């Protein structure tokens, strides 16, 4: 992901303020409400019939927390996204069968949550560095498909 030196600094500063457990449940929760066809992989999760049922479902929340804890690890290895996400790539391909379009959509839902959560501090120039991050993370997660 070529991020400029000025972009990297900004991404890491913002990231130090993120409670990963709470942002992860919110981002996966918004993925399931805004793009409802994404609920196809969660048939054992119970109630996902309304925005409030998706948002408050203990299973959605627990899953969001594990998904974003792994994503947080990528931000710590920005020059090696493909190797840090290789195992997870082989897992979403061979065992869970997830179309990688799914990662690009969550990535973009993430950008909106960060903007919401942080307000004015999520400036045009910070957005562009996050957009570089989200695309690199999604390219890395799709890398071992075949």
């Amino acid at each position: 992901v070529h991020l400029t030196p000025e972009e990297k600094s900004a991404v890491t500063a913002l990231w130090g303020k993120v409670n990963v457990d709470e942002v992860g449940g919110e981002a996966l929760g918004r993925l399931l409400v805004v793009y409802p066809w994404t609920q196809r992989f969660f048939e054992s999760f119970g109630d996902l019939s309304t925005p409030d049922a998706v948002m408050g479902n203990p299973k959605v929340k627990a899953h969001g927390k594990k998904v974003l804890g792994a994503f947080s690890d990528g931000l710590a290895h920005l020059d090696n996204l493909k190797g840090t996400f290789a195992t997870l790539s082989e897992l979403h391909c061979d065992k869970l069968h997830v179309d990688p379009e799914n990662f690009r959509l969550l990535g973009n839902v993430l950008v909106c949550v960060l903007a919401h959560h942080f307000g004015k501090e999520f400036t045009p120039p910070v957005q562009a560095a996050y957009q570089k991050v989200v695309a690199g993370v999604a390219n890395a997660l799709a890398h071992k498909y075949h």
């Binding site: 805004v34 793009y35 409802p36 066809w37 994404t38 609920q39 196809r40 391909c93 069968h97 997830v98 179309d99 990688p100 379009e101 799914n102 799709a142 498909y145 075949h146």
Partner: protein, 141 residues
């Protein structure tokens, strides 16, 4: 919108397809699977091999839906309603994939119809496939 000339070029081109519809469908599915591997995530337990009997079966179901859409060009939404409900509520395939399948069907038709795939015809077909794809995802959300 599809126009009178579009609807004319489509019927004439799909009409030439005829009884090969099934065969064309499976090739389009194979062209997809090979050129864009991410589409395979939707057929996890299919036997995806060259000549697979399962792929042949599914291409025939696909070609047949397109036949019904051609025969109801004037009202595809009513025509494809069991089909959009099934894609929106069960299958739940992501919208980026229908562009990939549409391209592969045009490539298959270009390779089988030398004389019928003229410039204006290719253009009407691209428009009808996009129209079929919008109807299939129209109940997604």
């Amino acid at each position: 919108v599809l126009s009178p000339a579009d609807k004319t070029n489509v019927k004439a081109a799909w009409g030439k397809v005829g009884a090969h519809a099934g065969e064309y469908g499976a090739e389009a599915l194979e062209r997809m699977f090979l050129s864009f591997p991410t589409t395979k995530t939707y057929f996890p337990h299919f036997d995806l091999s060259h000549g697979s009997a399962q792929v042949k079966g599914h291409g025939k179901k696909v070609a047949d839906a397109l036949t019904n859409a051609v025969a109801h060009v004037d009202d595809m939404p009513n025509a494809l309603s069991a089909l959009s409900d099934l894609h929106a509520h069960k299958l739940r395939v992501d919208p980026v994939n229908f562009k990939l399948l549409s391209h592969c069907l045009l490539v298959t038709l270009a390779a089988h119809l030398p004389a019928e795939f003229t410039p204006a015809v290719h253009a009407s077909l691209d428009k009808f496939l996009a129209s079929v794809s919008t109807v299939l995802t129209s109940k997604y959300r």
